[PDB]
Amino acid sequence: FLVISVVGSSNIDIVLKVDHFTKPGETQKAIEMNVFPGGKGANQAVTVAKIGEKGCRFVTCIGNDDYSDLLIENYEKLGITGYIRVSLPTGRAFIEVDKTGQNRIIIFPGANAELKKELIDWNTLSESDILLLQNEIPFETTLECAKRFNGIVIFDPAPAQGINEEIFQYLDYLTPNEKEIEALSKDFFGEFLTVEKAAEKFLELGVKNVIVKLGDKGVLLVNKNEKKHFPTFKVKAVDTTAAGDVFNGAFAVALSEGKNPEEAVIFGTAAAAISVTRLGAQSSIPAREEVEAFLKN
Amino acid sequence: MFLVISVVGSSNIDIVLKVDHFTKPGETQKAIEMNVFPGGKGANQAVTVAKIGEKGCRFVTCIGNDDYSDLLIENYEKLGITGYIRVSLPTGRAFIEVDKTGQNRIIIFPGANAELKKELIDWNTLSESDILLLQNEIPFETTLECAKRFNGIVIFDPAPAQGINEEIFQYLDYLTPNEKEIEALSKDFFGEFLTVEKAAEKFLELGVKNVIVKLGDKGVLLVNKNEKKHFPTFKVKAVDTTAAGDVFNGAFAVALSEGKNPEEAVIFGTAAAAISVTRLGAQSSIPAREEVEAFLKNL
């Protein structure tokens, strides 16, 4: 199988349950506070580990704090290696969630902001064949990795802000969701006509494959040779959080096992679909057996 | 020699998240900065007592077993502050979102503070104290039971003013509301708010021995059976009034401990508060005893 590395962000997700969204000037008691391992990078790494069942190499910067210990415990159980501890607080997502389950989020990069080129063990990274990237660490690091990686480079443009055009030519896969491809098109092409056309324009910048994740509507794969729409599974969704992360990790697992990109898209679609039926981010990541039972079923 | 002071109350980590604009529902926003500060009214007062009294402080408080509790223990240890109790809940924390205008909003997780129940109070040890500082940031039943049982001077800072039962007042030697608090308290317990002086008087009728109303710029009002003395404050360039009341209460108590009369103690606390409002922050604003003395001498 091909070896996967994720280079990206780890967060502790601090979920503050409240009756209503706190108003400016208001002091409100949290009904609950619960912490969970998180981060787009980690979510993808955890997906790879759980679905691939061969652990994951995950280059990520965390702190030296309790939350860091918590993440390491999580990583260690899953066979996830490659974390780097720094003296900053672990990256944090402060997630205020009201009684309806709507949320908002303040993100503190913390340790994630220390994941700079100088800390990448490039020799060890060259041992990998597939590389997963997002946009929650310094963009220059993500860019350098995409530039230097000999292997399949998958870039999740999430969030879409702060991305330089130089990265695209180095990508094998660009995996925006619908909101991201819109922002990205406006940004780089000065307009947003459609998903298909935006995807086409990215192929012009050197991106080999665009996979547009379309939620209910499924996924669009666009490359030189085809524009394949893949419908998704009709599930009862409860929480779409991390669905895209799950898609990317499971997609990468499939490629690692020698599946063609279309097969891999189907496999990750299955995984993502299971995940939206569960509350939470990493807690929603299905086990491989669950993904298989889905596709068999 | 000096009277021994105990604080029974709250310890909080204040987590200040600096943002461009208030985060909207459904929005993910990057914090410009995250800065963490020790807080809680109890701790602010204990730290005041320790730093201005220079004899440490007995401070019964519940904290967690987490990194933040470790940081609070280091702070407490260095200042000679003893009596904290560790529990398995997270240390109390407040998540303060501040936009570019300086307007804020706050989510408060009481955590360990909610575990400070009457069953955890070492009453034998507490009876070794002569002055008791209370606020309203732990379960009221605990605050109330302390004020009931304390043989000594009982000082109650009704902060926040909500959730207070009338029973506590008859056990108080000092009630120290600020202006918003005395208003709320008067409305709640006497059905109206006329004036600050009239409210303070009514509290005297419930058995409170002294009311000290903290009026900010306007100074402080002392009300008891024998007098209604207004104390102007010291004209300083204020920058941050955070914890000014906590500093007042702790410094006030230090003065009593050293045998100063309540009027002297008000002056002393006024001076300490006044220096604090000239400095950014809560516990970071607390002056050292020498600073308070240099202030008073300078008049």
The rounded distance, in Å, linking the Cα atoms of A127 and B221 is 74
Residues of chain A contacting residue B12, judged by C-beta atoms under 8 Å apart: none
Q: Could you say which of B29, B67, B95 has the minimum Cβ distance to residue A16?
A: B95
Residue A135 backbone phi and psi in degrees, to 5:
-125, 45
Please enumerate in sequence order all residues whose Cβ is within 8 A of that of B252, keeping only pairs 6 or more positions apart, or say none: B155, B174, B176, B212, B265, B266, B268, B269
Q: Which two tokens stand for residue B149?
A: 């049982």
Please enumerate in sequence order all residues whose Cβ is within 8 A of that of A159, keeping only pairs 6 or more positions apart, or say none: A135, A136, A180, B28
Q: Could you say which of A21, A28, A65 has the minimum Cβ distance to residue B25?
A: A21
Question: Contact B111/A159, CB-based, under 8 Å?
Answer: no
Q: Cβ distance A10 to A60 under 8 Å?
A: yes
Question: Contact B34/A96, CB-based, under 8 Å?
Answer: no
Q: Beta-carbon neighbour count of residue A92 at 10 Å?
A: 27
The rounded distance, in Å, linking the Cα atoms of B205 and B211 is 11
Catalytic member of A65, A156, A172, A245: A245
Q: In what order do the strands lie in the sheet with B227-231?
A: B81-86, B57-63, B5-8, B131-134, B153-156, B174-175, B210-214, B220-224, B227-231
CA distances from A228 to A85, A203, A241, B299 (A): 42, 15, 25, 83
Please enumerate in sequence order all residues whose Cβ is within 8 A of that of B119, keeping only pairs 6 or more positions apart, or say none: none
CA distance B90 to chain A (A): 9
The rounded distance, in Å, linking the Cα atoms of B119 and B131 is 21
Question: Contact A24/B24, CB-based, under 8 Å?
Answer: no
User: In one letter, which amino acid is B42?
Assistant: G
The rounded distance, in Å, linking the Cα atoms of B235 and B219 is 10
Task: Label residue A70 exposed, middle or buried (CB < 10 Å: 0-12, 13-18, 19+).
Answer: middle
Q: Could you say which of A30, A108, A159 has the minimum Cβ distance to residue B107?
A: A30
The rounded distance, in Å, linking the Cα atoms of B280 and B44 is 14
Apex B68 CA angle, B66 and B70, nearest 5:
75
Q: Chain A residue with minimal CA distance to B67?
A: A66
Q: Could you say which of A23, A98, A108 has the minimum Cβ distance to residue B31?
A: A108
Which residue blocks in chain A are alpha helix, DSSP H? 40-52, 66-78, 122-125, 139-148, 178-189, 195-204, 243-256, 261-275, 288-296
Question: Contact A106/B29, CB-based, under 8 Å?
Answer: yes
CA distance A112 to chain B (A): 12
Task: Label residue A140 exposed, middle or buried (CB < 10 Å: 0-12, 13-18, 19+).
Answer: exposed
Q: Which two tokens stand for residue B172?
A: 């108080």
Interface of A with B (CB under 8 A): 16, 18, 21-30, 33, 65-66, 89, 92, 94, 96, 98, 102-110, 159
User: In one letter, which amino acid is B212?
Assistant: I
Q: Beta-carbon neighbour count of residue A79 at 10 Å?
A: 14
Which residue blocks in chain B are alpha helix, DSSP H? 41-53, 67-78, 123-126, 140-149, 179-190, 196-206, 244-257, 262-276, 289-297
- Helix A243-256 to helix A261-275 angle (10° resolution) is 140
The rounded distance, in Å, linking the Cα atoms of B2 and B254 is 9
Q: Cβ distance B129 to B46 under 8 Å?
A: no
Nearest to A59 by CA among A25, A84, A22: A84
Q: Cβ distance B60 to B85 under 8 Å?
A: yes
């000014």: which residue's tokens?
A: B244
Question: Contact B108/A65, CB-based, under 8 Å?
Answer: no
Domains of chain A: 1-297 (3.40.1190.20)
Whether the upstream peptide bond of residue B160 has omega within 30° of 0, thus cis, is yes
Whether the upstream peptide bond of residue A261 has omega within 30° of 0, thus cis, is no
Q: Do β-strands B93-98 and B104-109 pair in parallel, antiparallel, or remain unpaired? A: antiparallel
Nearest to A161 by CA among A86, A107, A101: A107
Residues of chain A contacting residue B89, judged by C-beta atoms under 8 Å apart: none
């860019």: which residue's tokens?
A: A143
Does B130 participate in catalysis according to the annotation? no
Binding residues of B for ATP: 178, 214-219, 245-246
Nearest to B245 by CA among B179, B291, B164, B168: B179
Please enumerate in sequence order all residues whose Cβ is within 8 A of that of A267, keeping only pairs 6 or more positions apart, or say none: A250, A251, A253, A254, A259, A291, A295
Q: Chain B residue with minimal CA distance to A159?
A: B28
Q: Which of B107, B108, B137, B138 to mutate to test the interface with A (most CBs of A within 10 A)?
A: B107
């990750």: which residue's tokens?
A: A268
The rounded distance, in Å, linking the Cα atoms of A127 and A129 is 7
CA distance A103 to chain B (A): 6
Please enumerate in sequence order all residues whose Cβ is within 8 A of that of A246, keeping only pairs 6 or more positions apart, or say none: A43, A47, A268, A271, A272, A274, A275, A284, A285, A286
CA distances from B110 to A33, A35, B47, B136 (A): 10, 15, 20, 12
3-state helix, strand, coil in chain A (%, to 5): 40, 25, 35
The rounded distance, in Å, linking the Cα atoms of A89 and A71 is 13
Buried b (16+ CB within 10 A) or exposed e, B159-170: bebeebeeebbe
Q: Beta-carbon neighbour count of residue B82 at 10 Å?
A: 16
Please enumerate in sequence order all residues whose Cβ is within 8 A of that of B264, keeping only pairs 6 or more positions apart, or say none: B255
User: Is the dihedral angle over the CA atoms A253, A256, A257, A258 positive or is it negative?
Assistant: positive
CA distance A124 to chain B (A): 31
Question: Contact A29/B97, CB-based, under 8 Å?
Answer: no
The rounded distance, in Å, linking the Cα atoms of A171 and A163 is 13
> What is the DSSP secondary structure assignment for residue A11, as one 8-state letter?
E
Q: Which of B10, B17, B23 to mutate to test the interface with A (most CBs of A within 10 A)?
A: B23
The rounded distance, in Å, linking the Cα atoms of B179 and B228 is 16
Q: Chain A residue with minimal CA distance to B160?
A: A27
Q: Do β-strands A219-223 and B57-63 pair in parallel, antiparallel, or remain unpaired? A: unpaired
Report helix, strand or coil for A183: helix
Instruction: State the resolution, in angstroms.
Output: 2.2
Q: Which of A15, A26, A33 to mutate to test the interface with B (most CBs of B within 10 A)?
A: A33
CA distance B93 to chain A (A): 10
Report helix, strand or coil for A50: helix
Task: Label residue A54 exposed, middle or buried (CB < 10 Å: 0-12, 13-18, 19+).
Answer: middle
CA distances from A277 to A265, A273, B85, B114, B185 (A): 19, 7, 42, 35, 49
Question: Contact B95/A94, CB-based, under 8 Å?
Answer: yes
Q: Beta-carbon neighbour count of residue B207 at 10 Å?
A: 11
3-state helix, strand, coil in chain B (%, to 5): 40, 25, 35
The rounded distance, in Å, linking the Cα atoms of B84 and A85 is 31
